Amino acid sequence: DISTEKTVESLEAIRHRIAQIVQSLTHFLAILHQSESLSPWPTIHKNFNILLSQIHSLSNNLAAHSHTLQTTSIYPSLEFPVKEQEPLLTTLLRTKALPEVEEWEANTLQEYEASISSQPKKKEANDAYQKDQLWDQARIIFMEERENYSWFDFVTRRQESEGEFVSQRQLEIDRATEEQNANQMLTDILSFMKSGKR
């Protein structure tokens, strides 16, 4: 029964995540409906982004509890039997893929069939592994290369760092002190005019 309660807390977590994404999707729907003309690309795009963050969190939860979720299986019984007469159950627990998805899959598999027309299959899997390796290498060298540069400076490339140096805050401090001393010059000349202090 320990496995059962672990699956309980797990599916609790996924329930919370899917709840939040329902709320975000309904919000999106509302903003869409709010204006008769379609909404401005900046805002809709922003909402696509939040949607992405939600679905990413969900996929992480599912892969983390993937073992405990594929061992467990769901059948209705006992208390649903009062409403058991209805086909709502079959529609609710159905795991048929969407028709668009289903076709999609079929088409992509046909494409693989053109590819096998091109070449033999045994060679394909090792090449695939080698590529995944490639991508991981590209990732780490990009991290290094990026950490190498400097970003939030004014004209301060690597090359320009060798060249010269430019300071915004020093300019600002400079102008500030110049204006303050200039003001003291003012107050001094004003007291001179009023009553000689030359």
């Binding site: 982004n49 892969a63 995944d132 991508w135 991290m143 970003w151 204006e179």
Partner: protein, 66 residues
Amino acid sequence: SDSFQRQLVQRTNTLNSSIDNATLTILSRFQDILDIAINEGKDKYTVAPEVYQIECHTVSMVRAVE
């Protein structure tokens, strides 16, 4: 109201804020495409969100450039 110099520095800090924000989203988006480009775990259900993410990130990159 704010000083004249306050106005100037206000502006530049604004233009920066906006501009390092845009560059930083270019970097970070490309980075995260890369983080997602490997297909080793290859749970087809995980691969499909990944595809969405890829599309959404590239578009976010062009957005930043604009």
